[PDB]
Structures are given as structure tokens and as C-alpha cells.
Amino acid sequence: QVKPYVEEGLHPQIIIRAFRTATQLAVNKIKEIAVTVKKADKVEQRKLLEKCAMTALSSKLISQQKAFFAKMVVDAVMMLDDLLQLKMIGIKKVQGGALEDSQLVA
Amino acid sequence: MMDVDHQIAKLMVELSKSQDDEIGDGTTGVVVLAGALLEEAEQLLDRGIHPIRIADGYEQAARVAIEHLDKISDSVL
Amino acid sequence: NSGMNPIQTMTEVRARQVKEMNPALGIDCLHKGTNDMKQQHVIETLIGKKQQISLATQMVRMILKIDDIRKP
Amino acid sequence: RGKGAYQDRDKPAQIRFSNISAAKAVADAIRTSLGPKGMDKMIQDGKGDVTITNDGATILKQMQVLHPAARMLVELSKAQDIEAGDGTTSVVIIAGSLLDSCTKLLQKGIHPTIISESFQKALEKGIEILTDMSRPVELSDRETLLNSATTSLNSK
Amino acid sequence: RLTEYSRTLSGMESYCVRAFADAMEVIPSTLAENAGLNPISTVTELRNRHAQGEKTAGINVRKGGISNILEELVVQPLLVSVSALTLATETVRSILKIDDVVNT
Amino acid sequence: ASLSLAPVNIFKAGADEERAETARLTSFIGAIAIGDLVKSTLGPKGMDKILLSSGRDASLMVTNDGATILKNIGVDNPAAKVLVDMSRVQDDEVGDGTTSVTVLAAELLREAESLIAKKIHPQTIIAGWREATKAAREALLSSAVDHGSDEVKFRQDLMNIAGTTLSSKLLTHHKDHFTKLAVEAVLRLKGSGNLEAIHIIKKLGGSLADSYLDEGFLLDKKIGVNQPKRIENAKILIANTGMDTDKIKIFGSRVRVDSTAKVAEIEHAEKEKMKEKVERILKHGINCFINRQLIYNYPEQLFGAAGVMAIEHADFAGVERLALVTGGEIASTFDHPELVKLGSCKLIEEVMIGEDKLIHFSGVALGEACTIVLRGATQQILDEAERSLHDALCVLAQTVKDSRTVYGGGCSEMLMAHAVTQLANRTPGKEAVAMESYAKALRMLPTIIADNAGYDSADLVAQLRAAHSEGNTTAGLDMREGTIGDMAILGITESFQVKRQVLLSAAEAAEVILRVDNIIKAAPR
Amino acid sequence: ASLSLAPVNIFKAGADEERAETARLTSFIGAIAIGDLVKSTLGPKGMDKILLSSGRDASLMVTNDGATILKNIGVDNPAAKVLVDMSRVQDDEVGDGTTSVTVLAAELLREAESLIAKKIHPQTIIAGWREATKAAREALLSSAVDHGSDE
Amino acid sequence: PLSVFGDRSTGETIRSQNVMAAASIANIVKSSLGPVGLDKMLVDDIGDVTITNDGATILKLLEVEHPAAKVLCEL
């Protein structure tokens, strides 16, 4: 978008300042209009996590089982204790079997 | 034992190995079925259908077929 | 593979399967004289067929999702 | 009748499939140059000569194709250009699609002679249908002539 | 019409004529393509309109849809479609009668 | 000891030799390869080949003709060269039977290989084959039926023969139309065998069924600038004169004067001589003038002023065909108008075929010369149609020369094989085995014909053999469904000359190849 | 389409596959060549061969044994490898019969080639051969004579 | 599939390539426009020197092998 203005000889410092101002405004707007629920409801929190996981999953080859894998991921993260260490979630890959054959071990 | 260089051929080989590991039989039927599915998807693509739509339809039909197999199955002692 | 005409045999078997409720009618590969696989005792595990269909569908989806190749 | 005659060779099938694939590739090549919304191709030969064209016969003749089925399709486009002068892209697309269907027909286990006679029957029926759909025209009507010329030029 | 004719036929001839009709369906699909229209929906709508009796229904690119095209003044002489069909059929029949390639 | 396996070497570098077993192996391998290649293009249900040239031209050719297939292949096996030349000579002698003769020779050599493996001296095989060839020859000769006396039956025989010849080729799609066309074209020759009098013009575009035999004649030449494009009741004069800067043939002559006025006078004299020649030509009272050579501008305008068509540069074939079709005489002197016959035709005009313009002669006087317009969708289709039509015309002309006919569809081969078997059953020694192998090859021919159609060849051939043993001498393969039937009723007939030539040439080539026990190759160049 | 006769190349450099005609032809040629080589050393009037090793030692070995002839040759045709291994196993199981088994297998494969040329499905050939083998084995067993009692 | 003895480019690739070629030709002579434009000095690999501001001359002296750029040069 700024390439045409660069071709006209506009000073890059002006473009940098404009980007900084626009980004600050956009981040403030995102923080302002983001929807948050101040209830700390377990059911609502679980549903929010499941929906966020499904949205993060509905672009990959496992998107057909996105509800299944979102439920698994939410369960795993919730049962993680306090630091949410990634090394505390084992990922074992075994050849053969359908995607629905995948399981989460308690 | 087939010396292939194409990556999709390697995917076919891995599919056969997966069928062998999980079941042990039917390692030839999977390859023929996959080839038939891709052959049909070719003529579907030629008519301007997004490949993701083809994959979704295949998944739906596979669910239907698996349910039908469970329905018409028989038990042995 | 058995030398029979594929389309004619498959069409006739499918028509017989529709006409009479008998999902056991298949291809008489050994030319035993009957199309009923139950008397011919041609038995396959349900797990095997389900795995076949599942794996084939998943691999086909994975191949359909690829739209770029960057070999050296 | 039982087992029937065993197909010893299977090389004729390979040759036939290869011919069909070549024709289908040619059609898919000249597939985007069809209709009022088609776009021109650009061909640079072994010399420095450069051609920008939408004419199917010109596109096919300009690029060397090296495959016997593709060369026969080029000759087909030339013949259509001689007899008609337009539809050179459409005839090649039709031939490619016909052979693409022949692939599945042969794979079903149909001899490539039942296919030919059935295609002849279909062609005769289609000629009857097209003749039924046609409308008489006399050269005294300038509007029809202008509409035909404009339709011909719509894709260039 | 050729699909109907195949329905009137029997045996492998019916399958071959069905394949012929499906192959003929390519040109409307290609016309729907290259124009931004959805090929599947456009072809299905054309087939439905023609089954309803609209012999002149065709792909309309000015309005981005399907409508009568005689009012769009899109006409061509008969000895274009007839010639193309005849020549394509002859070429396909010639190619089908080939089973070997010899290098001279 | 042998030349190659000797402690001292007697050969130039690159020159080798092959002793008995090795030479026989190479010869049999080459012959079997040739036979396997040419077959599968045999019979009504045969397929065509693609001859993709690897040369600079990279010419593409699609054909069912065995002779053309064998011609355009790079052959290095000498026995394969023998078979190729046999096929070429077969084509030169008669128009058909090339694939049949090649396949028969290959099958004979395969049987010879089996017999040699069975420890039989090749001379014994050759003697047995000579006896079997004789027996089959009298069998076929006694089988022949002649219909030349009856005009309607002879015409029906010609129709059947042309249909049978065209059954294998690409013209089988419109067999009826093309058979009628070929029969009419041959019958217009009035018994003359010159196939050069029949011109096949290939014009791209249009369906193969659009091909037609013109009722008059067609010429691919042009007309002068100021000359009529259409005349009625033409009086054609066909000539071979120069009329192009016509020089007096005294090569040592030259013009040597002392003034340019004299040069101008000599030039006017030359033009006056040309004008006098044109006047002498016109004294014949003609409308259309056809010259073999070029016609320059001055005679062109002289003809135009007189309202005379002047077709130029019609080659020797052109003037010969025009003389045949119109009855004119090819003249080169015009001092005796009364002694030169002028061709006549009802109408001359220009027709529009494809995108080209041709001169059309209508209502010709004699008509003993034909032009056939071939329309097709590809160049390969046109070339193959021309080859098939040439085969049909050759066979029809041969049948006109000799009207004896034999039944096709393998009936003749079954009859020959039955006669050979009958001879072999009353002959002692291994020559009986050789004759049985001869019969086996003769039966293998229609076996290949049946295999090409996907039929039960073994069962059909067994049925045919049983029928011929019983006494049914006209039994043959019914290719419509896959049974055996009466060839006389079903109208499958062939020329006796073609079958006799096929049998004799195949036997000859098999005999000459079998006689070889050593192949010596010189150093290649 | 075929795995090798397709526009896309699915093989590494040097990989090769041989379809129906080529596979059957190579198998038949290899088997028949092996049978022809080992025969003529059969029966009381059989002759002996010379085996010249091409190695450093260039070991010389004249022999009539079929198994030793087939063992010390450079075989690259896979069907010929099958026949060589069959002859070796026959030698291991019993001392004699190494040449006879190879010749019999070669003749069987030659007849199979003829039958395939006659348009007979190889499964039919195999079924007929299995029945024939059962019948022949039964006849041979019925014809056996035992003399182990009398010294 | 096509088996054409040559290279093929289709879609956004060829369009962007043509745009790049035209843009390169424009950028060659964009600096010689208007009163504050400056001339160029062309050396013809045998020592011949051509100093010019005319666009046509600059485009004729340059040797170009991309056909869209050739189109602009002939323009």
C-alpha cells in the first residue's frame, strides 16, 4: 500500500510515524471493543475455550473432527495445573487408524 | 519394495503400510479405493468444484458407508 | 480379474441387491455358480472394511488439500 | 459365457490411454481461450517471432505439440477452420472431452468399437437435434448478418 | 436430448451415449468458467431451463446469469456447430481405431 | 572349426558371422517379430498403427496397410528385410493380401522353428512344404468360381469384393457408400487397367461420408486472365506445345545485326510467329485449349481476345487424363486440323471445393478417367482413406482382368488346410509332419482373424475344420456375431489371384529363409 | 495408464517396471534359456560343461551336475533366479534330480507361454496344472514298489 | 501431458512478468522527463557514444528480449 508513495519520493520517516500512530490506535481499539465476560463461570469458560479451539482448528486437515479435537485440547489444558507447560502434554504418533481413533489419556 | 520418487506415490506406500499395521489385511484394497476416489475427484475438479468441497463430500459419504457397514454386519462365535 | 465383463456383472449384481433385500450378493470370482457370498462363505472382518474406507478417505482428503510443490 | 478371451497384450490399452491423455491435455490448454470472456495466448517460436492470438487453429498450429494425438487434433482444428472458419476452439474442446469420457468407458470394460458405433449414433441424433433447433435465414436481412458478425467478434 | 436418447437405448450403447452427452456438457461449463460464474450452478440452471422448454436459454455474461440470448443477439450459423460436431466425432472415431505406435 | 571360433581371425574389424543355430535363431526371431507386428491389423476387426517418423520431417502416419507399415520401419534383421520385400512385391502385384502374406510367412517360419527343434532336417521340411503348397494350390484352383459371363452376377461379385476389401480399413464406417463409389470408378475404366486414369483428390474438411465420385472430371489448374470462366458445348484441344518464349530449336542460331531498328524488327517477327501459331491453333475451331506446358502472357491475351479458355501447366498425367475423359488427341503440330480429334464435353466451369477453386468438366464424351474427391477431418484420415481406396481399386481391377473368385473369411484357408491334411495323412516320413505344420499355419491365419475380434478363436476354428472335413466347402467365419456361416450367402468373396499370390509368395519366402544356415555381415559403413 | 508409460515420472533414476507382455516375455525367455542350458546334460548320454570363472583365480570346473552348473553362473533374469534356487533346494533335499526338475520346469513354462498365446487366462492354466499334478502324484505313488523287507 | 518442447507460463505469473517488463522499460526513461530531466549516455560496446534525451532513440538503441518491452519500444 505504501509502495506508490515511496515511488513518489515521500520521506520514509513520515511513513514510519504514520504506521506507528495507526498501530497504536488499532491496538487500543482492539483492547477497547474486545468482548470479555466477568463471571468466571466454569461452563461459560469451557464453552469459550472450546469455541476458540474450534476456530483455531477450522483451517487444517483435521477440521472435520474439529469439535472432537477441540474438546480434547480443552480437557488437556484445563487439567494442566498452573504453568501450562507444553512438556506436560505428551504427543504420541502411531501409524494406522482413523483420526477418530485418536485418544487423550487421563 | 517399490522404488518411487514421486511424493504422492510415497503417500500411497505409507497408506498401505498403515493398513498393514492397523489391520494386516486389505492393504491392496485401500490403494485401489484411493485411486478411484482421486480419479473421480479429477472430473469433479474439471467442473469447477473446490477441492475442499470434494473432501467434505467424501467425508460425509464415508461416514454414511461406515454406518451402513455397521448396520449390515454379522457376528460370529 | 476373473475374466468376466466388469460393468455388466456389477450392474446385474447391484440390480439383484436392490430387488431382493440381500447385501451379501457379490462377484462370483471363482465361478461357483452363485452370487451369494454367505453360502460361498466369503467372510471379511468389519474392522478391516471400516479401516479401509477411513484410511482411504483421510489420505484422499490430504492429497486433495495440497496445491503447491517445491521440490529442488 | 464364462472367462472369455484373455486380454494377453494390454499394450493397446496403454497406447489408447496415452492418446486420450494427450488430447485432454491439449483441450485443457486451449480451454481458457473460449467465449466472450476468454483471453489471448502468447506464443514465441524458435525464432524471435511473437504471436498474440485467440484463434484456436492459430494457437494449435503455432506451438509444436510432438504427440500424435495432439497433432491429429491440430489437423482437426485446421479442417474446421477450412470448412467453417470459427469454432476451431470448440471442436478441439469437444474432441478432448469425448476422449476423456472414452477413458472411463474403456475402463468399464467396453471394446473401443462399440464406443465408436455408439458415438456415430449419438452424432446422427445430435445432427437431427441441431437441425430441429435451427431457424431459417435469408441474406436480405442485414440485422441477422450484423448479429452473427458481432457474435463472432465478441471473443477477440 | 442425447441423455434422453440414451435412456431410450440399452446395453453398453446407453452408457456410451450418456458419456457422449456428458462430454457435450463441457462447453457450457467452460463458458460459465472464464466468466466468474459458478460452473455447476450455471450448468444445472441451463439444463433445468432447457428441460422446461426454453430452447434458447444460454449463458448471459452481460447480466452475469442465464437468460434468453436471442434478445442478447448472440447467434451463430448452423454450419458451425454441425461441422464441429461432425469433425470431432470423425476424429474421435479415427483415434479409437488405433492400438500401437511404431517409430520410423 | 568355424571362422569366428578359430585361433586365427579371418575377418575385417566389425565383420562377423553366425553359424547354424545362431543364424536360424536370428532369422526366426526377426520373422516372428515382423509377423507379430503386422498382425492384429488383420481382418474386419483389426486396428491401425501410428508411424511416428523420427526424422527431420517427423511425419505422422496412421495406417492399416501392412505394406506401408513394413516399408516405413528401420529394419536391420536380414530375414525381416526378406519379409518386407515380400510384402512390397505383394503390394506391387496385387493391391491386397500384404498382411495376409506376411502373417502366413511368419507362421510358416514359426512351425519350421518347432520342427527344427524336433530334430528334422530343413530340407525335409522344404520338400514337405513344396508338396503341401502344390496340394493347396490345386485345392484353391478347384475352389474358384467364375461369374464374368453374367453381367449382374459379376457386378454383385464386384460389390462383394470391394466391400470385403474395405471391411478392414477405416472406410468400414461407410463401407456401402465407399464400395459403390469404388465399383463405379473401376467400371468407368472400360476394362483398361491403368489406375493412373483414376485421380484421388484429398481436400481437408467435411465428413468422410462427403466424399464422392464426380460424374465428370476435375482439374486443379487455373485459367488465363481475360478468358471465359464457363463454356457450354466445349470443343477441347489438348496440346503439348511450348508456347513459352518459343525458340527455334537450332541451338547455334543467334541474332547479329548492326542497328537496334533491326533488333526491333526481329522481335516483331518473333511475336508475329507466335501470333501465327495461335492463329493456327484457333483454326481448329475450339473453345477450350489445354496445354501441358506453360503459357506466357502474349499467347494468353491472344486466347483471351478470341474467347478461348487456356488451361496451362497440366502435367503429363493431366493431359493423359483429359484425353481419356474427353476423347481428345494430345497434339503438338497444327498444320493439319482435319487430322486432330477434339475432345468434347457438355460444360466447363469453376467449382468451389473447400477453400479452393477447381475446373470442372461435366457431361464428358468418353469418361474413361475418374476423379474422386476425398473429404476428411484430418490429414491422416485423408491419407488412410486414399490408401484404402487404392487397395479397393487395385483389387477390383484385378478382378476385372481375371473374374475367378474365391470365398474369404478363412474359408479358403480351411479348404487349403483340409487338402494339405488329406495329403499328409497318406504320406510316410517326417514330410507328413512338415505338411501338418503347413496346415497348422494355414489354419492359424483365420485363428488370428478371430482373435482380433475377441472371439473364441479356438472353438470357431475347430468348428470350421469340422465343417470342411464334413463337406461344407463354403463354411467361413461370420464376423457379425461370432459364429460360422455360409460365405456364398453372406457375400464375402475375394479375388482368386490375390489368394493364390498370397499362398505362393508366403511359401516362397518361407522356403528361401529356411534354406539359410549362416549369416555373414560385412563391416558396416 | 501405466506406472511407467505415464506423463508424470514415478520412479527413481534407474528404477524400471515391466508390464504384462514384457514381464511374461522376460520370465519365459529366462526360464527357457535356463532349461536349454542345463539340458543336453541329461540321461546316460548327457555331456559335461566347462565353467570358467572370470575372477582372479579363474577357477576351472568341468561338471555334469545341474545344480553346480546353475549355481556358478551370472544370472540376472529373476525367473532364472527362481529356477536356480529351485534346483539348489532340490539338491539339498535329495542328491539327484537337479537337472530333471529344471528341465521339467522350463518345459512347463514353455507350454504356459504357448497357452497364453492361445488366449488362456493364467489362472485357468494354474488350476489345470494343480489338478494334473495331483493326478500324476497319485499315479506315481500307486506305481511305487517297496523291497525294504527282503534283504 | 502437453509434451510441447518449450516453457509455459500461465495466470498471475505471466501477467506479473509482463507488468515487470513494462515497468522496467518505463523506469529506463522515466528520468528524462520535463525541464529538470537529465540526458543519458549510451555506450555501444565498440566505444560508440550516444548522448540523448529522446525516448525513441534510447529505446531503439537498447536491445530488448522481452516481447512486452518490445511492444512499448515500438509504441
Ligand SMILES: Nc1ncnc2c1ncn2[C@@H]1O[C@H](COP(=O)(O)OP(=O)(O)O)[C@@H](O)[C@H]1O
Ligand atoms: N456475447 C456472448 N455471450 C455468450 N456467449 C458467447 C458470446 N459471444 C460468443 N459466445 C460463445 O463463445 C463460444 C466460443 O467462441 P470463440 O471464443 O469465438 O471461439 P470459437 O468461435 O473458435 O469457438 C461460441 O460458441 C459462442 O457461443
Ligand SMILES: Nc1ncnc2c1ncn2[C@@H]1O[C@H](COP(=O)(O)OP(=O)(O)O)[C@@H](O)[C@H]1O
Ligand atoms: N466381412 C468379412 N468377413 C470375414 N472375413 C473378412 C471380411 N472382410 C475381410 N475379411 C478377411 O480379412 C483378411 C485380411 O484382409 P485385409 O486386412 O483387409 O487385407 P490384407 O489381406 O492385406 O490383410 C482377408 O483374408 C479376409 O478373408
Ligand SMILES: Nc1ncnc2c1ncn2[C@@H]1O[C@H](COP(=O)(O)OP(=O)(O)O)[C@@H](O)[C@H]1O
Ligand atoms: N541307464 C539308464 N537308462 C535309461 N535312463 C536312465 C539311465 N540312467 C539314468 N537315466 C535317466 O536319466 C534321467 C536324468 O538323470 P541324470 O541325467 O543322472 O541327472 P539328474 O537326475 O540330476 O537329472 C533320470 O530321470 C533317469 O531316469
Ligand SMILES: [Mg+2]
Ligand atoms: Mg486379503
Ligand SMILES: [Mg+2]
Ligand atoms: Mg468464433
Ligand SMILES: [Mg+2]
Ligand atoms: Mg485387404
Ligand SMILES: [Mg+2]
Ligand atoms: Mg541324475
